[PDB]
């Protein structure tokens, strides 16, 4: 009793049905087994870090600090509540000051307290071979305070209350900090650097100028791609691609403040009247990748209200 004698009675036609069934079953089984294996052997999500004082940076792993160096810390802290010699930290008790050097300044550099000043007497200045590093540390701290109080304050509160600190630039390395690594120089010439010689409210404008050509546009494109790599959000983060000179997206102004701050850093601290002398930072010019490192907010940036009041954006 069939309406397909040519399909249900012939041996060849009778094998069509079984072949199709087996093919469908095997395809489904293959897909299911592969995806089950992938989802069963794949690792768990890479979680974030939740330090109360940092964004995406941790100082908690603590073995750079000597087990004996902590003892002289407590011995000095018990000895005197008030700081004997403070020039920048004029408004903190020795308890808070010690809790701040253990947490932030040494955590951002990942160095022992012997790296700066002498364990036998913390407040002595010029009685050991490592005093120049302490002077450089004070100058670095003053620079951080200046940067907080002049450029980060101008940014709106919607961005956040994040403030610059020691771990923002150094990122856990005392010395050997390198802006412009080989990783971020992918499609650019390896000698290229950010052009900190220009006036940034109108420095890189190229649209409809008639006095420039593809050379200037190439330089502008190099700078723009560096900005793209430093943030990791692509070219549409600060621009409306239908008209580049437009001011709509509201991160094109924050970028202006960043450009002015970077130019100020290069002109005041990196090479003030010559990098060879009268200059901290060892002549290493800054870049957007130095702090940001591929994220909108720098991983080492401190949450609002954590740095000392003298160094905060609002003192």
């Amino acid at each position: 009793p069939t309406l397909f004698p040519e399909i249900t009675n012939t041996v060849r036609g009778r094998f069509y049905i079984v072949a199709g069934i087996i093919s469908v079953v095997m395809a489904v089984a293959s897909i299911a087994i592969f995806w089950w294996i992938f989802y069963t052997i794949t690792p768990a999500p890479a979680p974030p870090l939740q330090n109360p004082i940092y964004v995406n940076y941790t100082q908690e792993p603590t073995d750079y600090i000597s087990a004996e160096s902590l003892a002289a810390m407590n011995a000095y802290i018990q000895a005197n509540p008030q700081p004997q010699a403070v020039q920048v930290l004029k408004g903190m008790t020795t308890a808070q000051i010690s809790a701040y050097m253990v947490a932030q300044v040494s955590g951002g550099l990942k160095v022992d307290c012997s790296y700066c000043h002498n364990i036998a007497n913390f407040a002595q200045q010029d009685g050991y071979p490592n005093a120049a590093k302490k002077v450089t540390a004070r100058k670095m701290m003053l620079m951080s305070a200046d940067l907080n109080q002049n450029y980060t304050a101008k940014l709106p509160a919607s961005v956040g209350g994040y403030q610059i600190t020691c771990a923002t630039c150094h990122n856990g390395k005392a010395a050997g900090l390198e802006p412009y690594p080989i990783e971020i120089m992918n499609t650019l010439p390896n000698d290229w650097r950010l052009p900190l010689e220009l006036d940034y409210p109108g420095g890189l404008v190229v649209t409809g100028r008639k006095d420039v050509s593809n050379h200037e546009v190439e330089q502008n494109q190099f700078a723009m791609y560096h900005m793209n790599v430093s943030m990791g959000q692509g070219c549409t983060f600060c621009h409306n691609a239908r008209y580049f000179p437009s001011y709509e997206i509201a991160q094109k102004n924050h970028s202006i403040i960043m450009l002015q701050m970077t130019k100020h850093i290069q002109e005041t601290y990196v090479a003030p009247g010559g990098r060879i002398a009268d200059g901290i930072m060892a002549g290493k010019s800054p870049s957007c990748w130095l702090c940001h490192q591929g994220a909108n907010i720098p991983p080492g940036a401190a949450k609002p209200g954590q740095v000392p009041a003298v160094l905060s954006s609002t003192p």
């Binding site: 009778r14 049905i17 069934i21």
Partner: peptide
């Protein structure tokens, strides 16, 4: 009851396909 209902439906599918295939190929 996610596994039990799936098992019941799959068993029904297998038994029905066995029955119909036996009907056709005989």
């Amino acid at each position: 009851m996610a596994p039990f209902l799936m098992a019941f439906f799959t068993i029904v599918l297998i038994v029905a396909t066995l029955y119909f295939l036996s009907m056709i190929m005989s």
